[PDB]
Design an enzyme around this catalytic site. Structure first.
Site, PDB file in Angstrom:
ATOM      1  N   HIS A   1      -4.856   7.442  -1.934  1.00 56.21           N
ATOM      2  CA  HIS A   1      -6.020   6.795  -1.542  1.00 56.21           C
ATOM      3  C   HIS A   1      -7.101   6.519  -2.048  1.00 56.21           C
ATOM      4  O   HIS A   1      -7.132   7.265  -3.172  1.00 56.21           O
ATOM      5  CB  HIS A   1      -6.703   7.328   0.163  1.00 56.21           C
ATOM      6  CG  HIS A   1      -5.724   7.543   0.992  1.00 56.21           C
ATOM      7  ND1 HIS A   1      -5.019   8.003   2.032  1.00 56.21           N
ATOM      8  CD2 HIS A   1      -4.366   5.725   1.160  1.00 56.21           C
ATOM      9  CE1 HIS A   1      -3.939   7.574   3.138  1.00 56.21           C
ATOM     10  NE2 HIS A   1      -3.768   6.612   2.174  1.00 56.21           N
TER      11      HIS A   1
ATOM     12  N   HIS B   1       1.533  -1.114   0.114  1.00 57.45           N
ATOM     13  CA  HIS B   1      -0.232   0.679   0.142  1.00 57.45           C
ATOM     14  C   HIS B   1       1.105   1.175  -0.218  1.00 57.45           C
ATOM     15  O   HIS B   1       0.231   2.147  -1.016  1.00 57.45           O
ATOM     16  CB  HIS B   1      -1.061  -0.168   1.099  1.00 57.45           C
ATOM     17  CG  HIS B   1      -1.706   1.336   1.623  1.00 57.45           C
ATOM     18  ND1 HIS B   1      -2.610   1.654   1.516  1.00 57.45           N
ATOM     19  CD2 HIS B   1      -0.632   2.395   1.877  1.00 57.45           C
ATOM     20  CE1 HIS B   1      -3.042   2.921   1.565  1.00 57.45           C
ATOM     21  NE2 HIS B   1      -1.725   3.482   2.413  1.00 57.45           N
ATOM     22  N   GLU B   2       1.435   1.250   0.840  1.00 59.13           N
ATOM     23  CA  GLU B   2       2.329   2.870   0.948  1.00 59.13           C
ATOM     24  C   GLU B   2       3.755   2.673   0.161  1.00 59.13           C
ATOM     25  O   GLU B   2       4.241   3.446  -1.061  1.00 59.13           O
ATOM     26  CB  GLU B   2       3.685   2.474   2.239  1.00 59.13           C
ATOM     27  CG  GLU B   2       2.918   2.512   4.144  1.00 59.13           C
ATOM     28  CD  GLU B   2       1.903   3.463   3.863  1.00 59.13           C
ATOM     29  OE1 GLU B   2       2.451   4.431   3.150  1.00 59.13           O
ATOM     30  OE2 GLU B   2       1.345   3.430   5.047  1.00 59.13           O
TER      31      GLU B   2
HETATM   32 ZN   LIG Z   1      -2.099   5.610   2.387  1.00 61.11          ZN
END
Ligand SMILES: [Zn+2]
Ligand SMILES: [Ca+2]
Ligand SMILES: [Ca+2]
Ligand SMILES: [Ca+2]
Ligand SMILES: [Zn+2]
Lengths: 5, 166
Positions: free
Chosen positions: B128, B118-119
């Site tokens: 996001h 995700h990062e």
């Molecule tokens: Zn995030």
């Protein structure tokens, strides 16, 4: 950004 | 806090470095989790990621607790799990993981692979997702699967920046 609860 | 942005990297070949390791996992497990996390994105783009063992890389990865350099401090167990910066010099692209969490390669605590994938999305220029089922959704959800499929919302986002892969 990662968030829990 | 200290922030960097550009929409995306102007090159397709990026470097990363694992600055330090969490004690919750072995060096080999930490290295595998990050390598798979980059694989999630290079599987569907022309992006390539090369690991460095010293010096300064595009994406510096480190585990820290509370205040750790950028004045966006972590908050102890749970809550904030990690964060990362959009493309750019210095902090740009870097990924920080809160070492007050128990990081695991399985399900015992927080899955390092999932959070990193995700990062690294952010490190590449992604925002996001409005979709709670997309990888880039900001709330951590554990899947419980013996495999990971990158959702379509995330593929379209990263391909809008760098185009498709194989
Ligand atoms: Zn995030
Ligand atoms: Ca935390
Ligand atoms: Ca950087
Ligand atoms: Ca820990
Ligand atoms: Zn940070």
């Amino acid at each position: 950004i990662m968030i829990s609860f | 806090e200290y922030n960097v942005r550009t929409l995306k990297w102007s090159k397709m070949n990026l470097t990363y470095r694992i600055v330090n390791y969490t004690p919750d996992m072995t060096h080999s497990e930490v290295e595998k989790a990050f390598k798979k996390a980059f694989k999630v994105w290079s599987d569907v783009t022309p992006l390539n990621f090369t690991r460095l063992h010293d010096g300064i890389a595009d994406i510096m990865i480190s585990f820290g607790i509370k205040e750790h350099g950028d004045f966006y401090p972590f908050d102890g167990p749970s809550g904030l799990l990690a964060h990362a910066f959009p493309p750019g010099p210095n902090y740009g692209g870097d990924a920080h993981f809160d070492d007050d969490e128990t990081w695991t390669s399985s399900s015992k605590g927080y899955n390092l692979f999932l959070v990193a994938a995700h990062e690294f999305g952010h490190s590449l220029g992604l925002d996001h997702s409005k979709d709670p089922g997309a990888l880039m959704f900001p709330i951590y959800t554990y899947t419980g699967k013996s495999h990971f499929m990158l959702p379509d919302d995330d593929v379209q986002g990263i391909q809008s920046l760098y185009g498709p892969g194989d």
